Amino acid sequence: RPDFCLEPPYTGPGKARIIRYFYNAKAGLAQTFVYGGIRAKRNNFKSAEDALRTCGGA
């Protein structure tokens, strides 16, 4: 699994409030979180399906 998949979601320093997805490795599912609009970490997807294709495991 890529190493970023187990990291907590990162809102970042931006003031926006955009709904993104992170892979929740303990649930084995994607979950939504509020993203501030700049300086994303890599556990940050536009869709559940992208989070699972990247992070869901072989």
Side-chain angles (χ1 to χ4, degrees):
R1 198 169 261 109
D3 55 29
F4 57 84
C5 297
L6 290 207
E7 294 318 290
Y10 186 74
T11 297
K15 297 185 178 202
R17 299 181 70 88
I18 300 307
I19 306 307
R20 292 284 182 83
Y21 293 79
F22 71 101
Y23 183 73
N24 180 334
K26 291 194 225 83
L29 293 168
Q31 177 180 343
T32 55
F33 79 103
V34 174
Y35 175 53
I38 199 162
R39 308 201 64 77
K41 302 306 178 183
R42 293 180 73 188
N43 193 11
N44 178 330
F45 300 95
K46 290 179 183 193
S47 63
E49 68 184 2
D50 283 351
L52 294 181
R53 263 188 81 95
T54 308
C55 287

